[PDB]
Amino acid sequence: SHSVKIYDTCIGCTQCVRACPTDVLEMIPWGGCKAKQIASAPRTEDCVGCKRCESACPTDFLSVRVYLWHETTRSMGLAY
Amino acid sequence: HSFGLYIHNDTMSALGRPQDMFSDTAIQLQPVFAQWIQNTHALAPGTTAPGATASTSLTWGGGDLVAVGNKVALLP
Amino acid sequence: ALRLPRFSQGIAQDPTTRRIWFGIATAHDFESHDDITEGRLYQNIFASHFGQLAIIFLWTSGNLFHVAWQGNFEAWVQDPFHVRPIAHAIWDPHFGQPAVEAFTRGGALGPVNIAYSGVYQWWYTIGLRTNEDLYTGAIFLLFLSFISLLAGWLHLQPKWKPSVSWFKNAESRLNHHLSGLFGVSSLAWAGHLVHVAIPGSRGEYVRWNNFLDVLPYPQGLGPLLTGQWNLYAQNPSSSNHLFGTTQGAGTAILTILGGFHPQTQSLWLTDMAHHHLAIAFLFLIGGLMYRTNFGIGHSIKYILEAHIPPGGRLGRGHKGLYDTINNSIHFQLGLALASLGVITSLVAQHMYSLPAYAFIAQDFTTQAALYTHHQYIAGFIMTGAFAHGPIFFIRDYNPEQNADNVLARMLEHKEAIISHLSWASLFLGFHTLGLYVHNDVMLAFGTPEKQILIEPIFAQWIQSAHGKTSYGFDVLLSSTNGPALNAGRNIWLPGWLNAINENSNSLFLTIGPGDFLVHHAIALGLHTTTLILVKGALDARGSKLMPDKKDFGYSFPCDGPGRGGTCDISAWDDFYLAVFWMLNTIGWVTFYWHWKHITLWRGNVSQFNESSTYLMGWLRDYLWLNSSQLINGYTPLVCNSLSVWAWMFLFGHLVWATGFMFLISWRGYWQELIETLAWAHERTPLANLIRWRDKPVALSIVQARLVGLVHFSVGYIFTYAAFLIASTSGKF
Amino acid sequence: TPPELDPNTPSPIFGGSTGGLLRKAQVEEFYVITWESPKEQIFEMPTGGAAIMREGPNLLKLARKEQCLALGTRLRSKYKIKYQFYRVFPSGEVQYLHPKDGVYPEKVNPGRQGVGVNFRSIGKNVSPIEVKFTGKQPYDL
Amino acid sequence: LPSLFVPLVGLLFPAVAMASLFLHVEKRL
Amino acid sequence: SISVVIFHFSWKMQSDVWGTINDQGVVTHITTGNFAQSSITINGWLRDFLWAQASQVIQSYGSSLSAYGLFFLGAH
Amino acid sequence: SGLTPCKESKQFAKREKQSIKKLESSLKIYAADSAPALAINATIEKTKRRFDNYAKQGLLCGADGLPHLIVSGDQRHWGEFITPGILFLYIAGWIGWVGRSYLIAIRDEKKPTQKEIIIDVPLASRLVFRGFSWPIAAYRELLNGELVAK
Amino acid sequence: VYFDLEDIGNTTGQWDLYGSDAPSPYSPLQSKFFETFAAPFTKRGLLLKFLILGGGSTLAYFSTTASGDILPIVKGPQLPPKLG
Ligand code: CLA
Ligand code: CLA
Ligand code: CLA
Ligand code: CLA
Ligand code: CLA
Ligand SMILES: CC1=C(/C=C/C(C)=C/C=C/C(C)=C/C=C/C=C(C)/C=C/C=C(C)/C=C/C2=C(C)CCCC2(C)C)C(C)(C)CCC1
Ligand SMILES: CC1=C(/C=C/C(C)=C/C=C/C(C)=C\C=C\C=C(C)\C=C\C=C(C)\C=C\C2=C(C)CCCC2(C)C)C(C)(C)CCC1
Ligand SMILES: CC1=C(C/C=C(\C)CCC[C@H](C)CCC[C@H](C)CCCC(C)C)C(=O)c2ccccc2C1=O
Ligand SMILES: [Ca+2]
């Protein structure tokens, strides 16, 4: 499946989690920003790689990145 | 079944086999349905439409031609 | 592993048809393979290298075999001017009776293809005379091709595999490639010339049976070791000399006459034996510069470390640059390809102007074919050189280890490099097109006197310096009171001045305003293609739009629609862009070459000189004009021997346009289409008894651009080749 | 907390569509999404055209999951509804997917533990050469 | 007439090659 | 689709319809009825249609029709 | 300069001759006192004037019979390239210098983009004639020509 | 219509739709004739080899021929340009 990482540059806006069509990310407690939360990629097996998450990050540089990797049925978005 | 017939024709011609082409002089694909209609509009005036003196179009005329100047206006 | 491709587990677990596609396009990218080590990397390449040589030896072996078995050659040797060389025989059951008649040419017994590679003139010049000679040559290469495979297999065995440090022994390899691979090879080639080639051009046949009790020279090696080498140039072949015969034959084996042999219109054999002998010296002595195991020589590293201009205007100069190149195979391939690409063009530009093979200049189709051949090879090689350059920056470039050296400073001021290349391209583009269009309007309004026809006097001045009488100018070698002239006076100059001022040959052809414009087109083509490629290389590791373009590799589809949209942002993709421009550039080059030459051979340089200044002229008087015999290869009335070129001509157009589909329409459309077909198959009775083992999916984003580009390129090459050969050979 | 389980609950009123399950559902996986409806309502089907929600508990089987979230997301807004979806497999085992941790993912929960987070953020990753030949990748670090 | 090596290269080799590749490609160790 | 439609029109009319007629009945069409035997081949379309008929627009410089010559290249 | 001056080129004379005969041919259908005739006679007079000037200004011609330009720098042909060029660089410099005078005037202001899509014509008219002395850009170059940040 | 974990097969429409399940309509003996005479080709592998080697050589065999096009035939060859 694809590879998705998060960085301490994250501000806890939570927008990507809202942007994801396959429920890959989620927010977890943290203490590196005023929001006190940070994104996480606990289910990268369900990711498709549409990068809607990245398209929704306001950090100067994306704090969530998606590195397209090995292709699986799940990632190829196949209903057959 | 349209374009592939052309490529067939190109290859046969280039190989010097005109008789193996889709043409009027070889393997004919005569569009008979459009031809029959064409003929029907020819026999239309007087027969089907008695009020019509001449044909609807000269493309259905058969043996009628119209010229203006030295140039051809229309014909079957 | 588990299944193909088992050099990559992650790609074998692909349940779609993509696993097969990508399994083929990554088979040679050894570094991306599973469990790869630096040891296995150098060993796989080394082995592949033997495999490549084996194929090359085998390939040439095929040509020799077929020319001997299905070609005249012997008939061609007697009448070079009036015999068409045969490529091989044609056996095609699809052939109609006419096609068999129309194609049986060259005095063959059946339908044959006419060779346009020029191996006939090459082998005749080389010394080969009969078919027996060709067969034993074919045997020899078949043998060499076997020992290539044998050696490739040998060094894949554990007790014969070379260590990585052996591959990184640069100074030893250079000392041997310069001295042995270049020098000794060239030295021994001049040996073949004075033993076989030169005496063969003088009627005497020297093969293995009698090359021992037969002297290449009357004084026979005496004067060489004596020091009076001048004796070998004492009696050259006459001006009335006939090739292959004793009529006018001399005794000399090493001369410097310059110019051409009158009969063959090619360089003197005694000029070329001398050439390679002289070459072999600078190479033999040259391959003793670097250090090995004898306590003498140079440390390449230490030289680079020492070349730092004080006042640090180049920073730390070339320090650490030795390891940067010796550790990165891509840097080496890039340097190799760039160098090779340049001398590939050098070959092209020299073999049409200074023919080295007997009776090759008279064969116009061969001359046109060979020139176009190499200029496209050179072009492709050049883009690859600028592809591994980027790959190097991504995979092997170490920023800290190249701190502030010339390589690093490139990236440091990359914006300046790119913007100026952009300016140069914009300047050339705006005016070359501008002048072409202005002239077209004048011709349209019927006022050719209003054209802008700039004389290329700079280049005309060069030709004068070479000794061309036209234009006047009174430059060096064009002036009686010139130190340069009187220095070379009656050595190579009488032969040179005679040849450069002959109106038949292609030795520094007369150029005018029409030549001025196309050259700027050429200049435009070069600058733009370089602009694309170096912008690709210098941005491979990142930009403002994608700061971390590394981490993603050389080839990736994109980075999504965010940040404005990032399609074709990878270094692989600007390669993809540059190939188009390089195809456009070489296209302009070969159009220029072929039009100038067909008008010359036709004795009508007027048509080129007056029509090449406006673009309608190119369309009408070059492309539309010379397409006549080609497109009539087959007709509603008949078929000709040019029918195959007519067929290929359309074939090229078809492949070319088919590629437009992959380049214009992109993936999401086709993916949604296929999944409706996936539905159909499962819901169709009798058909759903049969199930696919690989899931049908649309070609990937990058794969599309590759497939599209290949079609575009194949069409490009096959279309022009169909035109180049037919229009030429139809007229000759 | 334990996830909900099912299932014998009815499914919505639909007429049939071509976007339905295929062999993949039979041999690979298929998904189910479930929800509670206050009224019998009409909704747009991701696979098809239009279907009628059935008042009370509702069960829908869809292929691919994304279809599950797309419909579910639509259920959350538009009308207010609480939904959940599971992964079926073919053996009969079932797997609870979303929400999966009590609460929705947008909302921070204390139970959750981070996965795939790099504390040296930035593009402070190392050059590819540095990991060359090391199965690793720069981001993985 | 040796020109009957054509079908062999022309068809037989390709068929064998394709069949073999097809099999290797669909293999599941 | 439309491009091959209007090419179908242009060739068919010149070849089989339009042309000069004199007062003996003798009809001489513009392209002389070559549609039937040469439009059935892609090479025929390239040669007898495009190559042949494009001669007017590429030989229009100096004429009143040179603007078409300019727009021809201009559109390419 | 392997060419021959146009004044003494036969090909150059044949073109003027052939062109005039073509226009005169058309002259026949329209009769005399006529609009097209006056229009054609005006083209003929414009034609003669053209060729006359080219010869008069010492422009070489090629075997083609058409003038060719010398851009080497040779003094006899500055008119051909160098003189017009300097004229260009003056204007090009003018336009660019005025264009750059506007952006600097605009840069420190409110919404700077607002005056890039809606021109401040009073400001532009104030700055247009500054390009007249634009080659005193040189004296800006001795100090504040280009930014030091990059 | 239904949905039970108990029976996934049925849940996901794995139905042998147009399947017969009916007894053999073929007359016996006829079947037995075909069952004993087509038996060698049913072993696989060997059929693959029989079709390659057999199909290959059978093809080669039609190497031999006449009214194919093996006749440039008595036709004076043209020159036909600069000559050759
Ligand atoms: C180098 C490859 C190659 C070769 C050697 C051939 C050879 C032939 N082709 Mg094929 N073809 C090819 C490539 C090739 N083609 C490609 C790439 C295409 C796609 C464009 C085609 C499309 C094509 C078409 C549409 C037709 C041919 C036809 C023919 C036959 C015409 C000669 C004839 O009439 O005699 C004799 C005519 C016969 C019918 C004799 C039959 C030959 C016997 C039955 C062979 C026995 C079957 C063979 C053993 C099974 C193969 C086994 C093998 C795969 C292991 C000839 C056998 C024509 C044809 O076969 O007629 C129907 C024809 O219609 N070709
Ligand atoms: C010394 C010569 C040389 C060598 C050793 C290499 C070696 C390599 N190249 Mg480079 N390259 C070269 C020259 C060379 N190249 C030139 C001259 C160009 C300009 C065209 C390129 C442009 C290039 C690009 C863009 C890429 C490489 C890549 C690679 C690497 C992977 C190769 C691979 O597995 O793919 C296998 C290749 C194939 C299976 C060939 C299939 C596609 C070909 C082009 C189609 C064949 C043409 C067509 C079918 C002709 C038949 C038509 C018919 C009608 C007659 C490998 C290290 C890749 C890389 O960087 O690694 C990630 C990469 O993407 N090369
Ligand atoms: C004939 C088609 C065509 C043309 C005209 C161009 C032109 C250009 N290309 Mg493109 N290219 C093409 C095909 C073409 N390309 C294709 C098929 C590909 C493969 C995808 C590419 C890939 C490519 C890449 C990757 C790059 C280019 C670049 C460029 C620019 C190069 C610099 C230059 O020439 O300055 C001169 C400008 C021109 C020649 C075009 C100007 C057109 C007219 C003359 C302008 C005047 C307009 C006039 C007033 C009429 C106005 C009309 C009215 C309605 C307003 C130039 C604009 C490079 C670039 O951007 O340069 C920095 C760049 O890197 N090209
Ligand atoms: C249906 C149309 C058709 C077909 C099927 C053929 C077929 C053939 N032609 Mg004919 N030809 C045609 C039309 C056609 N032609 C027309 C219209 C003309 C103009 C009149 C000609 C003019 C012509 C000439 C002059 C010649 C032929 C020859 C040949 C034969 C090539 C023999 C060969 O190399 O083997 C195999 C094919 C190849 C080696 C080339 C294939 C290239 C592929 C794409 C390389 C890429 C492969 C890739 C790596 C994938 C590999 C997988 C694979 C191994 C499974 C073959 C029988 C030649 C011949 O007689 O043989 C000696 C010959 O010289 N043709
Ligand atoms: C203030 C106006 C201005 C100035 C001083 C410059 C200056 C420069 N440009 Mg830019 N450019 C401009 C406008 C300008 N440009 C506009 C509007 C565009 C969009 C088409 C561009 C697109 C452009 C590209 C792609 C490139 C440059 C480049 C360059 C540099 C090299 C010279 C050149 O090729 O330019 C050529 C000019 C053009 C291609 C466009 C024509 C610009 C028009 C004619 C001027 C604008 C007039 C403006 C509306 C006046 C406002 C009046 C005001 C008082 C109200 C030089 C620094 C090159 C570079 O980077 O150098 C290394 C380069 O590759 N320019
Ligand atoms: C003596 C003589 C001469 C000479 C001249 C010269 C001196 C020369 C030259 C030359 C030159 C001067 C050449 C060049 C070139 C080049 C090129 C072609 C390039 C390239 C490249 C590339 C492709 C790169 C890549 C890369 C990258 C990008 C990254 C890093 C790595 C690398 C490096 C790989 C003359 C003629 C005058 C006269 C006569 C004689
Ligand atoms: C002489 C001559 C010639 C040659 C020339 C040359 C070769 C030269 C050159 C040149 C060069 C080599 C130049 C350079 C440069 C540079 C630079 C570095 C620049 C800059 C700039 C700037 C900065 C500008 C700016 C501006 C202005 C000033 C104006 C407007 C605005 C603007 C901003 C644009 C010829 C033969 C052709 C012709 C005759 C004459
Ligand atoms: C047509 C098309 C397809 C559909 C094309 C497909 C699925 C190609 C499938 C290939 C078929 C099976 C025939 C291929 C046979 C060729 C002769 C290749 C030879 C086989 C080997 C030698 C490689 C895409 O998937 C696509 C994706 C992205 C951009 C553009 C396009 C696009 O234009
Ligand atoms: Ca010459």
Swiss-Prot record, chain A:
The eukaryotic PSI reaction center is composed of at least 11 subunits. It comes from Pisum sativum (Garden pea). This is Photosystem I iron-sulfur center. Residues 1-30, 38-67 form the 4Fe-4S ferredoxin-type domain. Apoprotein for the two 4Fe-4S centers FA and FB of photosystem I (PSI); essential for photochemical activity. FB is the terminal electron acceptor of PSI, donating electrons to ferredoxin. The C-terminus interacts with PsaA/B/D and helps assemble the protein into the PSI complex. Required for binding of PsaD and PsaE to PSI. PSI is a plastocyanin-ferredoxin oxidoreductase, converting photonic excitation into a charge separation, which transfers an electron from the donor P700 chlorophyll pair to the spectroscopically characterized acceptors A0, A1, FX, FA and FB in turn. Its EC number is 1.97.1.12. It catalyses: reduced [plastocyanin] + hnu + oxidized [2Fe-2S]-[ferredoxin] = oxidized [plastocyanin] + reduced [2Fe-2S]-[ferredoxin]. The gene is psaC. [4Fe-4S] cluster 1 binds at residues 10, 13, 16, 57.
Swiss-Prot record, chain C:
P700 is a chlorophyll a/chlorophyll a' dimer, A0 is one or more chlorophyll a, A1 is one or both phylloquinones and FX is a shared 4Fe-4S iron-sulfur center. It is found in: Plastid, Chloroplast thylakoid membrane. Its main location: plastid. It catalyses: reduced [plastocyanin] + hnu + oxidized [2Fe-2S]-[ferredoxin] = oxidized [plastocyanin] + reduced [2Fe-2S]-[ferredoxin]. It is a multi-pass membrane protein. The chain crosses the membrane at residues 45-68, 134-157, 174-198, 272-290, 329-352, 368-394, 416-438, 516-534, 574-595, 642-664, 706-726. SUPFAM superfamilies: Photosystem I subunits PsaA/PsaB (SSF81558). Its EC number is 1.97.1.12. Chlorophyll a B1 binds at residue 653. It holds the Pfam family PsaA_PsaB. Belongs to the PsaA/PsaB family. This is Photosystem I P700 chlorophyll a apoprotein A2. It comes from Pisum sativum (Garden pea). The gene is psaB.
From Swiss-Prot, chain E:
Keywords: Chloroplast, Membrane, Photosynthesis, Photosystem I, Plastid, Thylakoid, Transmembrane, Transmembrane helix. One of its GO terms (cellular component) is photosystem I. It is found in: Plastid, Chloroplast thylakoid membrane. It is a single-pass membrane protein. One of its GO terms (biological process) is photosynthesis. The chain crosses the membrane at residues 5-25. May help in the organization of the PsaL subunit. Belongs to the PsaI family. This is Photosystem I reaction center subunit VIII. The gene is psaI. The chain holds residues 4 to 32 of 40 of the full protein.
UniProtKB/Swiss-Prot annotation, chain F:
Chlorophyll a' binds at residue 76. It is found in: Plastid, Chloroplast thylakoid membrane. PsaA and PsaB bind P700, the primary electron donor of photosystem I (PSI), as well as the electron acceptors A0, A1 and FX. PSI is a plastocyanin-ferredoxin oxidoreductase, converting photonic excitation into a charge separation, which transfers an electron from the donor P700 chlorophyll pair to the spectroscopically characterized acceptors A0, A1, FX, FA and FB in turn. Oxidized P700 is reduced on the lumenal side of the thylakoid membrane by plastocyanin. Belongs to the PsaA/PsaB family. The PsaA/B heterodimer binds the P700 chlorophyll special pair and subsequent electron acceptors. PSI consists of a core antenna complex that captures photons, and an electron transfer chain that converts photonic excitation into a charge separation. The eukaryotic PSI reaction center is composed of at least 11 subunits. This is Photosystem I P700 chlorophyll a apoprotein A1. It comes from Pisum sativum (Garden pea). The lineage of its organism: Eukaryota, Viridiplantae, Streptophyta, Embryophyta, Tracheophyta. The chain holds residues 608 to 683 of 758 of the full protein.
